Design an enzyme around this catalytic site. Structure first.
Site, PDB file in Angstrom:
ATOM      1  N   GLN A 172      -9.598  22.156  14.100  1.00 24.69           N
ATOM      2  CA  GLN A 172      -8.861  21.409  15.114  1.00 24.69           C
ATOM      3  C   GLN A 172      -7.558  22.127  15.481  1.00 24.69           C
ATOM      4  OE1 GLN A 172      -7.277  16.805  15.969  1.00 24.69           O
ATOM      5  NE2 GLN A 172      -7.612  17.532  13.869  1.00 24.69           N
ATOM      6  N   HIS A 176      -7.140  24.235  19.264  1.00 21.60           N
ATOM      7  CA  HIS A 176      -6.148  23.669  20.170  1.00 21.60           C
ATOM      8  C   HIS A 176      -5.175  24.671  20.752  1.00 21.60           C
ATOM      9  CE1 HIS A 176      -7.792  19.795  19.580  1.00 21.60           C
ATOM     10  NE2 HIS A 176      -6.763  19.170  20.125  1.00 21.60           N
ATOM     11  N   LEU A 353     -18.716  22.039  23.782  1.00 26.73           N
ATOM     12  CA  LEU A 353     -19.409  22.301  22.536  1.00 26.73           C
ATOM     13  C   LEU A 353     -18.550  22.191  21.276  1.00 26.73           C
ATOM     14  CD1 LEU A 353     -21.798  25.256  21.816  1.00 26.73           C
ATOM     15  CD2 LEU A 353     -19.637  25.032  20.565  1.00 26.73           C
ATOM     16  N   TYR A 354     -17.245  22.427  21.409  1.00 23.03           N
ATOM     17  CA  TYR A 354     -16.349  22.378  20.263  1.00 23.03           C
ATOM     18  C   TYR A 354     -15.773  21.007  19.914  1.00 23.03           C
ATOM     19  CZ  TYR A 354     -14.788  26.294  17.301  1.00 23.03           C
ATOM     20  OH  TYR A 354     -14.654  27.234  16.301  1.00 23.03           O
ATOM     21  N   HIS A 357     -15.863  16.074  16.534  1.00 22.28           N
ATOM     22  CA  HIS A 357     -15.348  14.848  15.948  1.00 22.28           C
ATOM     23  C   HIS A 357     -16.142  14.276  14.790  1.00 22.28           C
ATOM     24  CE1 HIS A 357     -13.457  15.587  19.739  1.00 22.28           C
ATOM     25  NE2 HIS A 357     -12.397  14.982  19.241  1.00 22.28           N
ATOM     26  N   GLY A 495     -22.912  28.551  20.806  1.00 27.08           N
ATOM     27  CA  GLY A 495     -21.550  28.692  20.317  1.00 27.08           C
ATOM     28  C   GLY A 495     -21.172  30.061  19.777  1.00 27.08           C
ATOM     29  N   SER A 499     -17.743  32.183  20.677  1.00 27.31           N
ATOM     30  CA  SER A 499     -16.854  32.414  19.546  1.00 27.31           C
ATOM     31  C   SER A 499     -16.586  33.889  19.264  1.00 27.31           C
ATOM     32  CB  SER A 499     -17.442  31.754  18.294  1.00 27.31           C
ATOM     33  OG  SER A 499     -16.626  31.984  17.164  1.00 27.31           O
TER      34      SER A 499
HETATM   35  C1  HEM Z   1      -9.356  11.763  13.458  1.00 26.77           C
HETATM   36  C2  HEM Z   1      -8.837  13.006  14.173  1.00 26.77           C
HETATM   37  C3  HEM Z   1      -8.944  13.333  15.663  1.00 26.77           C
HETATM   38  C4  HEM Z   1      -8.314  12.582  16.639  1.00 26.77           C
HETATM   39  C5  HEM Z   1      -7.364  11.370  16.752  1.00 26.77           C
HETATM   40  C6  HEM Z   1      -8.692  13.376  17.782  1.00 26.77           C
HETATM   41  C7  HEM Z   1      -8.401  13.256  19.126  1.00 26.77           C
HETATM   42  C8  HEM Z   1      -8.520  13.655  20.429  1.00 26.77           C
HETATM   43  C9  HEM Z   1      -8.051  13.089  21.688  1.00 26.77           C
HETATM   44  C10 HEM Z   1      -7.237  11.804  21.809  1.00 26.77           C
HETATM   45  C11 HEM Z   1      -8.435  14.025  22.578  1.00 26.77           C
HETATM   46  C12 HEM Z   1      -8.312  14.046  24.104  1.00 26.77           C
HETATM   47  C13 HEM Z   1      -9.348  13.175  24.817  1.00 26.77           C
HETATM   48  C14 HEM Z   1      -9.255  12.975  26.331  1.00 26.77           C
HETATM   49  O1  HEM Z   1      -8.524  13.625  27.121  1.00 26.77           O
HETATM   50  O2  HEM Z   1     -10.096  12.122  26.712  1.00 26.77           O
HETATM   51  C15 HEM Z   1      -9.165  15.049  21.852  1.00 26.77           C
HETATM   52  C16 HEM Z   1      -9.773  16.242  22.186  1.00 26.77           C
HETATM   53  C17 HEM Z   1     -10.355  17.416  21.738  1.00 26.77           C
HETATM   54  N1  HEM Z   1     -10.621  17.443  20.401  1.00 26.77           N
HETATM   55 FE1  HEM Z   1     -10.168  15.847  19.022  1.00 26.77          FE
HETATM   56  N2  HEM Z   1      -9.519  14.479  17.564  1.00 26.77           N
HETATM   57  C18 HEM Z   1      -9.637  14.504  16.184  1.00 26.77           C
HETATM   58  C19 HEM Z   1     -10.343  15.623  15.786  1.00 26.77           C
HETATM   59  C20 HEM Z   1     -10.869  16.872  16.048  1.00 26.77           C
HETATM   60  C21 HEM Z   1     -11.655  17.838  15.307  1.00 26.77           C
HETATM   61  C22 HEM Z   1     -11.797  17.800  13.785  1.00 26.77           C
HETATM   62  C23 HEM Z   1     -11.994  18.770  16.205  1.00 26.77           C
HETATM   63  C24 HEM Z   1     -12.866  19.988  15.948  1.00 26.77           C
HETATM   64  C25 HEM Z   1     -12.518  21.453  16.090  1.00 26.77           C
HETATM   65  C26 HEM Z   1     -11.492  18.354  17.495  1.00 26.77           C
HETATM   66  C27 HEM Z   1     -11.579  18.763  18.809  1.00 26.77           C
HETATM   67  C28 HEM Z   1     -11.235  18.643  20.130  1.00 26.77           C
HETATM   68  C29 HEM Z   1     -11.397  19.461  21.324  1.00 26.77           C
HETATM   69  C30 HEM Z   1     -12.082  20.823  21.450  1.00 26.77           C
HETATM   70  C31 HEM Z   1     -10.833  18.663  22.270  1.00 26.77           C
HETATM   71  C32 HEM Z   1     -10.549  18.990  23.732  1.00 26.77           C
HETATM   72  C33 HEM Z   1      -9.212  19.653  24.018  1.00 26.77           C
HETATM   73  C34 HEM Z   1      -8.940  19.807  25.497  1.00 26.77           C
HETATM   74  O3  HEM Z   1      -9.767  19.896  26.423  1.00 26.77           O
HETATM   75  O4  HEM Z   1      -7.706  19.743  25.724  1.00 26.77           O
HETATM   76  N3  HEM Z   1     -10.858  17.136  17.400  1.00 26.77           N
HETATM   77  N4  HEM Z   1      -9.296  14.786  20.507  1.00 26.77           N
HETATM   78  C1  LIG Z   2     -22.271  35.035  12.756  1.00 25.84           C
HETATM   79  C2  LIG Z   2     -23.089  33.913  13.413  1.00 25.84           C
HETATM   80  C3  LIG Z   2     -24.059  34.379  14.498  1.00 25.84           C
HETATM   81  O1  LIG Z   2     -23.757  35.111  15.400  1.00 25.84           O
HETATM   82  O2  LIG Z   2     -25.256  33.908  14.356  1.00 25.84           O
HETATM   83  C4  LIG Z   2     -22.195  32.825  14.070  1.00 25.84           C
HETATM   84  C5  LIG Z   2     -21.005  33.123  14.821  1.00 25.84           C
HETATM   85  C6  LIG Z   2     -20.230  32.080  15.413  1.00 25.84           C
HETATM   86  C7  LIG Z   2     -20.651  30.698  15.251  1.00 25.84           C
HETATM   87  C8  LIG Z   2     -19.875  29.569  15.875  1.00 25.84           C
HETATM   88  C9  LIG Z   2     -18.458  29.493  15.729  1.00 25.84           C
HETATM   89  C10 LIG Z   2     -17.738  28.421  16.345  1.00 25.84           C
HETATM   90  C11 LIG Z   2     -18.428  27.436  17.100  1.00 25.84           C
HETATM   91  C12 LIG Z   2     -19.824  27.496  17.250  1.00 25.84           C
HETATM   92  C13 LIG Z   2     -20.578  28.552  16.649  1.00 25.84           C
HETATM   93  C14 LIG Z   2     -21.841  30.468  14.488  1.00 25.84           C
HETATM   94  C15 LIG Z   2     -22.605  31.489  13.905  1.00 25.84           C
END
Ligand code: HEM
Ligand SMILES: C[C@H](C(=O)O)c1ccc(-c2ccccc2)cc1
Ligand SMILES: *[C@@H]1O[C@H](CO)[C@@H](O[C@H]2O[C@H](CO)[C@@H](O[C@@H]3O[C@H](CO[C@@H]4O[C@H](CO[C@@H]5O[C@H](CO)[C@@H](O)[C@H](O)[C@@H]5O)[C@@H](O)[C@H](O)[C@@H]4O)[C@@H](O)[C@H](O)[C@@H]3O)[C@H](O)[C@H]2NC(C)=O)[C@H](O)[C@H]1NC(C)=O
Ligand SMILES: *[C@@H]1O[C@H](CO)[C@@H](O[C@H]2O[C@H](CO)[C@@H](O[C@@H]3O[C@H](CO[C@H]4O[C@H](CO[C@H]5O[C@H](CO)[C@@H](O)[C@H](O)[C@@H]5O)[C@@H](O)[C@H](O)[C@@H]4O)[C@@H](O)[C@H](O)[C@@H]3O)[C@H](O)[C@H]2NC(C)=O)[C@H](O)[C@H]1NC(C)=O
Ligand SMILES: *[C@@H]1O[C@H](CO)[C@@H](O[C@@H]2O[C@H](CO)[C@@H](O[C@@H]3O[C@H](CO[C@@H]4O[C@H](CO)[C@@H](O)[C@H](O)[C@@H]4O)[C@@H](O)[C@H](O)[C@@H]3O)[C@H](O)[C@H]2NC(C)=O)[C@H](O)[C@H]1NC(C)=O
Ligand SMILES: *[C@@H]1O[C@H](CO)[C@@H](O[C@@H]2O[C@H](CO)[C@@H](O[C@@H]3O[C@H](CO[C@@H]4O[C@H](CO)[C@@H](O)[C@H](O)[C@@H]4O)[C@@H](O)[C@H](O)[C@@H]3O)[C@H](O)[C@H]2NC(C)=O)[C@H](O)[C@H]1NC(C)=O
Ligand code: HEM
Ligand SMILES: *[C@@H]1O[C@H](CO)[C@@H](O[C@H]2O[C@H](CO)[C@@H](O)[C@H](O)[C@H]2NC(C)=O)[C@H](O)[C@H]1NC(C)=O
Ligand SMILES: *[C@@H]1O[C@H](CO)[C@@H](O[C@H]2O[C@H](CO)[C@@H](O)[C@H](O)[C@H]2NC(C)=O)[C@H](O)[C@H]1NC(C)=O
Ligand SMILES: CCCCCCCCO[C@@H]1O[C@H](CO)[C@@H](O)[C@H](O)[C@H]1O
Ligand SMILES: CCCCCCCCO[C@@H]1O[C@H](CO)[C@@H](O)[C@H](O)[C@H]1O
Ligand SMILES: CCCCCCCCO[C@@H]1O[C@H](CO)[C@@H](O)[C@H](O)[C@H]1O
Ligand SMILES: CCCCCCCCO[C@@H]1O[C@H](CO)[C@@H](O)[C@H](O)[C@H]1O
Ligand SMILES: CCCCCCCCO[C@@H]1O[C@H](CO)[C@@H](O)[C@H](O)[C@H]1O
Ligand SMILES: CCCCCCCCO[C@@H]1O[C@H](CO)[C@@H](O)[C@H](O)[C@H]1O
Ligand SMILES: CCCCCCCCO[C@@H]1O[C@H](CO)[C@@H](O)[C@H](O)[C@H]1O
Ligand SMILES: CCCCCCCCO[C@@H]1O[C@H](CO)[C@@H](O)[C@H](O)[C@H]1O
Ligand SMILES: C[C@H](C(=O)O)c1ccc(-c2ccccc2)cc1
Lengths: 553, 553
Positions: A172, A176, A353-354, A357, A495, A499
């Protein structure tokens, strides 16, 4: 006259262009195919495709026979395979970038305006018979219903790979820095103009913010002492905009690169570790370079931390995520003999994809104390109360939830998935099956083939009507997972390219930058080459807790 | 303690890094050399340098033996040589970019902030014994004195290669899309954030300006009819900031992409030709694609014009400039099998190098009339009075002045050269000889060797005191010229790398973009592939005048 490109006639990355009033032509240039719809394969194209084992078989090979892999990992074969992985995966991502929310064709604006997220497949034409093109119903399933029915967690499902919260918060915190969708501009737009690992979540996404966060002495970042420990400064000393609920005293607001990090102690935890690493590196650099001024000390520390980040993400983060017995390796030189562009543009599909949650737990355990979401979210004293070591130990011990499979998103944050599905429709993302093909996989012939079961498949079939209308995000989270895996094949096959392209496409990995002098000499270069999660925490804390991306035994 | 890097100790692109209070170390990574100063060659490095013919000899081979080149140009050997030229020249330019006016070291800020011009060699350290490092006097010669003494024209010297004003104005017009130094921010900063051939001088360097210039109908650019001919619109119709003397009302100003083009009829002439070409291309596109909207027509036409520009620049502009018997070729496919980055960052040294004011004549001849600078500059009616064909014919027939050799800049614009020299000192550009070495040439051992004569050499010697103190720009302009050439070898050896990198580094030349669909199909793609100066003019004018980059025989 129905828009012919609504049928997605052009295959294998061929480009559909409307000609005349009702015709179309496919540009098969360098696709390895020919014919009206770019379906006639060339010799090598055919051999490569008919002899290529499936993603499932390869995943099997990579997660079995540790004895053989242990042997391989100690030979030149480790480099040969890592190079293959790097080149084959990244070759799937267009570079320079192609489309964006405004243009479904190449254009100078799409190339130059970095406020736009890019996209891999063009949007579903606004003039198509149905929301997804030609298949499905006139109206898509209600986002809220879809989420409550298939994504909402009932009973916590832990990740079978042993992934923990230390990993979840790392992911996370890490993502971000490049996923920062602009509220003012809307979907399709980002504020993370760096489009990659620039560490803007530590230093800020803009210069004015960076300056307010810097101490301007010894290249360091401002900080404050609490209980004899180092922490990010308060907004009073570093007047930077932070997203905190109204009513919270400025003295209790910590100032860091990313505005939303006050949301979770887990986020401020990493912000603290990295801030300390930065200042620690500044000290090492100063001892080596007494003549350097504040600027060079700061800039060089940043480059070192960028390198340390990429190193840990490839060799520890992706390693944990993949479950591979092949020892991944971060070595830019592996690509110095290949054709590779050192640039990256964040894709809207990558953002979708990322959203991992499902990783979040039902509650957060810190020793004997269990904390609810209401005691955790926006809690501004937990980090200082427990200190870094205690939280790292706790997060490293608690398991994170499984990502793929469905029904595993805690009700407290289910609303995010709902908005992601809604965003997907505003962006008019093509159907899941079109993305499967775009990433080299065969499209699913039915929902049963997708889920691997019958009940959910039947309900999805009723809601979507056709497997070819299934949307991107739901498809990713509902696809059956690999044996004992955190998620399905599509998450990996789609992904991995984004990545890897994002990690190696960083300018520091280029032949021009990847040199000792870039990092202040051998000391700094070695910090990058030998970085680890354990060292990142333990060299910046008084005691060394259990630290890892997987739960202990 | 004197700054050790003030002696420019590291050779062959090795990187000088300060260690401790008074020591230094050279990073020789991938230079092909080793040792304290990066001077010990590896076997292959030595082999290559010993077998490498001199720039003079290669220049000789390229300008002799017509019978042989006629054979070469009709075969694949032409392509083999062009690829060699391309790769070998562009390899001298760092990519991703390295330094800028604020950082004499690689930094994330230098990589990401495009408001900075980049630089190939770090600046002269601010704490050196002398202004140029350690050589020369404590005070450099007065810029004004230098210009009057060696750059001021006394008797007009025509270019021996037959270069005309049509060429001169094309160059001035073309280069101003990527050289736009920011007055507000100062030296080292640019407003041309595209850093290359983006045609911002036609479409504007910012979106807001582009929108004011567009008709938003049929993808076209606004325009006005005058005497039955098409010209750019007035500022009253397209409210963009144009730099005109105070007092000239909006209705009398012409609005184009570049704010300074109202300065010369020669500039507005090209602004007019390209505007007509844009709208002409829009027509061809609409005939082929009746379903396309205004935005896609606009964007596709822009891509086509960018392609036509690079084609004409490489195959006619550079061809005229080089005088090579080898027929240069614009073919992106030549680099598809090589390692090459499709990005460019404009260098401050390239900006300096391109100040070709010596090209400008004593007066401007249009048929029987001869116009002075007073009558030519800021003339708001000449273009419309004569029309495009007439001015093209006139400029194509008038010889341009020789660039190298010295004493050939009209007194009316000598003040520009004075400011270039002053700017150079604010930028703290390293001496001419350091740049000679950076670009593969031997440094000059004396001013006599530099100029090829004795009178100027003796005076320069007394003013500078040492050949190693000679500055960049003066060096380029005072170097002896090749036999019957427009300028010296340094201009070619330093200019070619920057030029070619900037042309081929454009994303439209990448494998991802260089496809027929990018340009709307075969029709647009062939417009790019067969573009010609003559066609650019004659297909956009009533009659076809004499048009070329060289005067008629
Ligand atoms: C309990 C903890 C978490 C809370 C409260 C939370 C919260 C939020 C909120 C409020 C948003 C924005 C939603 C909107 O605009 O509708 C968001 C987005 C996002 N979150 Fe989470 N989240 C949590 C965990 C995580 C985890 C563990 C990941 C995984 C890597 C992650 C990934 C993302 C991504 C990629 C976005 C979009 C960012 C963007 O477009 O700006 N979050 N989350
Ligand atoms: C080495 C392996 C492959 O290339 O197979 C690989 C590389 C990247 C990810 C990844 C990372 C973040 C989000 C989603 C996927 C998963 C597997
Ligand atoms: C990256 O890409 C994004 C997306 O495109 C950019 O977004 C922003 O920029 C856009 C362009 O500035 C914003 O578009 C809006 O357009 C509205 C409509 O204006 C129309 O254009 C002119 C307006 O001028 C008219 O004449 C006089 C001339 O001076 C003028 O003073 C007067 O106001 C009058 O309106 C006219 O021809 C038409 O009739 C319309 O008025 C504007 O009103 C609005 O202010 C804005 O400009 C867009 O909204 C911006 N934001 C977003 C999220 O789209 C972004 O700027 C790009 N980034 C970079 C660095 O290029
Ligand atoms: C590409 O690169 C260029 C070159 O760096 C960059 O230039 C511009 O940006 C910088 C930073 O914005 C400008 O900085 C100027 O210098 C001073 C800095 O000193 C003062 O800054 C603060 C003053 O205001 C603040 O003070 C109080 C503290 O009491 C604080 O609480 C408030 O927040 C208040 O605003 C202060 O912290 C400090 O102590 C000093 O007083 C700036 O203040 C001043 O405004 C200037 O802007 C450069 O001047 C800009 N131009 C140039 C040519 O350098 C570009 O922005 C960059 N582009 C991109 C896209 O990144
Ligand atoms: C932000 O985070 C901080 C943590 O740093 C929160 O403060 C901490 O809150 C906990 C829980 O309220 C406090 O609990 C302590 O330990 C016991 C816990 O209860 C016991 O276990 C169960 C639960 O009822 C029962 O079976 C037992 O009988 C017993 O009740 C509690 O009883 C003690 O009184 C004690 O408070 C913890 O002390 C506290 N830490 C600090 C340093 O204040 C804080 O609430 C949170 N902020 C917000 C707004 O939520
Ligand atoms: C912007 O450019 C326009 C041209 O497009 C300028 O207007 C033009 O100005 C010229 C001279 O200033 C006008 O010349 C015309 O023809 C003769 C030329 O002179 C003759 O040749 C020499 C010169 O002395 C002598 O041997 C002859 O005896 C004779 O003088 C001139 O005599 C006529 O009177 C006539 O003006 C030309 O006509 C004019 N074109 C137009 C349509 O206006 C304009 O001045 C310039 N703007 C600025 C600010 O300089
Ligand atoms: C009728 C003749 C011309 C006049 C009046 C003229 C004038 C000027 C002026 C007034 C400046 C800016 C100086 C400053 O800020 O101090 C400038 C810059 C410049 N000129 Fe010329 N010029 C002429 C011709 C040419 C030609 C033929 C070329 C060659 C391609 C050229 C190239 C340049 C370049 C590269 C710059 C720098 C631009 C920048 O950094 O923004 N000029 N000129
Ligand atoms: C190429 O793709 C088109 C688009 O789906 C295919 O469909 C077209 O041709 C069919 C063959 O007779 C017709 O039955 C369809 O009505 C027609 N559809 C459209 C939208 O025009 C076409 O068969 C494909 N051709 C090949 C060689 O694969
Ligand atoms: C490396 O480069 C340095 C700098 O040009 C050379 O100069 C240093 O060593 C000389 C040896 O006699 C001294 O005379 C110079 O004063 C000294 N200057 C400096 C930078 O302190 C040096 O000789 C070169 N050495 C090699 C191995 O070529
Ligand atoms: C050349 C030797 C081939 C041996 C065949 C090995 C069989 C492995 O078979 C694999 O089993 C997995 C489940 O365990 C499936 O998910 C894969 O799709 C399947 O290919
Ligand atoms: C060059 C890289 C080769 C990678 C091949 C590794 C695949 C490991 O394959 C393993 O071989 C074992 C044989 O004893 C079988 O018992 C295992 O089931 C099988 O997964
Ligand atoms: C960098 C490109 C190298 C091409 C050399 C041909 C070797 C084929 O290599 C194969 O590529 C497949 C992906 O398409 C992988 O799935 C296979 O495991 C791999 O052996
Ligand atoms: C047995 C060990 C194999 C190591 C090579 C694995 C790296 C190749 O990975 C391949 O990348 C392709 C493009 O993204 C995908 O289409 C393939 O399904 C995937 O297996
Ligand atoms: C058969 C291969 C023979 C290689 C001989 C190496 C010749 C280069 O020799 C080098 O020249 C430099 C410049 O004069 C010196 O500074 C180095 O000390 C010297 O080793
Ligand atoms: C004329 C003989 C030319 C020999 C070319 C040398 C090839 C490079 O030789 C290298 O020298 C290094 C320094 O001792 C060693 O550490 C490397 O192992 C060795 O491969
Ligand atoms: C493959 C590239 C070959 C480049 C060689 C071209 C150089 C032409 O060279 C010319 O050849 C003539 C032969 O009649 C001589 O008379 C000329 O003096 C000589 O300059
Ligand atoms: C006889 C035809 C030769 C064609 C090859 C010419 C292109 C290579 O050009 C070379 O580029 C180098 C780097 O910029 C310079 O250092 C050399 O002096 C120059 O000759
Ligand atoms: C093909 C030839 C070569 O590479 O030899 C070449 C290429 C570029 C220029 C040039 C262009 C602009 C300014 C200065 C120089 C000159 C010669």
């Amino acid at each position: 006259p129905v828009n012919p490109c609504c049928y997605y006639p052009c295959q294998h990355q061929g480009i559909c262009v409307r000609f005349g009033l009702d015709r179309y032509q496919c540009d098969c240039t360098r696709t390895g195919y020919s014919g009206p719809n770019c379906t006639i394969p060339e010799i090598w194209t055919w051999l490569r495709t008919t002899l290529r084992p499936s993603p499932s078989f390869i995943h099997f090979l990579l997660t079995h026979g540790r004895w053989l892999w242990d042997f391989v990992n100690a030979t030149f074969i480790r480099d040969t395979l890592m190079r293959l992985v790097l080149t084959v995966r990244s070759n799937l991502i267009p570079s320079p970038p192609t489309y964006n929310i405004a243009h479904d064709y190449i254009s100078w604006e799409s190339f130059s305006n970095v406020s736009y997220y890019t996209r891999i497949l063009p949007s579903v034409p606004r003039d198509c018979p149905t929301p997804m093109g030609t298949k499905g119903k006139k109206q898509l399933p209600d986002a809220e219903f879809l989420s409550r029915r298939f994504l909402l967690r009932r009973k916590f499902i832990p990740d079978p790979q042993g992934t923990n919260l230390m990993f979840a918060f790392f992911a996370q915190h890490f993502t971000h820095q490049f996923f920062k969708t602009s509220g003012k501009m809307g979907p399709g737009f980002t504020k993370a103009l760096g489009h990659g690992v620039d560490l803007g979540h530590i230093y800020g996404d803009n210069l004015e913010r960076q300056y307010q966060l810097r101490l301007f002495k010894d290249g360091k970042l401002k900080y404050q002492m609490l209980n004899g420990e180092v922490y990010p400064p308060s907004v009073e000393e570093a007047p930077v905009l932070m997203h905190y609920p109204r009513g919270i005293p400025p003295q209790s607001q910590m100032a860091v690169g990313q505005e939303v990090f006050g949301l979770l102690p887990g986020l401020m935890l990493y912000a603290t570790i990295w801030l300390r690493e930065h200042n620690r590196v500044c000290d090492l650099l100063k001892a080596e370079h007494p003549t350097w001024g504040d600027e060079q000390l700061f800039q060089t520390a940043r480059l070192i931390l960028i390198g340390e980040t990429i190193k840990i993400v490839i060799e520890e983060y992706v390693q944990q995520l993949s479950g591979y017995f092949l020892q991944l390796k971060f070595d830019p030189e592996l690509l110095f003999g290949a054709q590779f562009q050192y640039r990256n543009r964040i894709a809207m599909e990558f953002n979708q994809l990322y959203h991992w949650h499902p990783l979040m737990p039902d509650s957060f355990r810190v020793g004997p104390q269990d904390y609810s979401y209401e005691q955790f979210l926006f809690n501004t004293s937990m980090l200082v109360d427990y200190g870094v070591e205690a939280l790292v130990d706790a997060f490293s011990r608690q398991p994170a939830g499984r990502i793929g499979g469905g029904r595993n998103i805690d009700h407290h944050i289910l609303h995010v998935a709902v908005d992601v599905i809604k965003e997907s429709r505003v962006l008019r993302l093509q159907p899941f099956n079109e993305y499967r093909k775009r990433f080299g996989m065969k499209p699913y012939t039915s929902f049963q083939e997708l889920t691997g079961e019958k009940e959910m498949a039947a309900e999805l079939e009723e809601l979507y009507g056709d497997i070819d209308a299934l949307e991107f995000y739901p498809g990713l989270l509902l696809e059956k997972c690999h044996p004992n895996s955190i998620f399905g094949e599509s998450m990996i096959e789609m992904g991995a390219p984004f990545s890897l392209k994002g990690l190696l496409g960083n300018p520091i990995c280029s032949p021009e930058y990847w040199k000792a002098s870039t990092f202040g000499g051998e000391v700094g270069f070695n910090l990058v080459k030998t970085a680890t999660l354990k060292k990142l925490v333990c060299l910046n804390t008084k005691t060394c807790p259990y630290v890892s991306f997987h739960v202990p035994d």
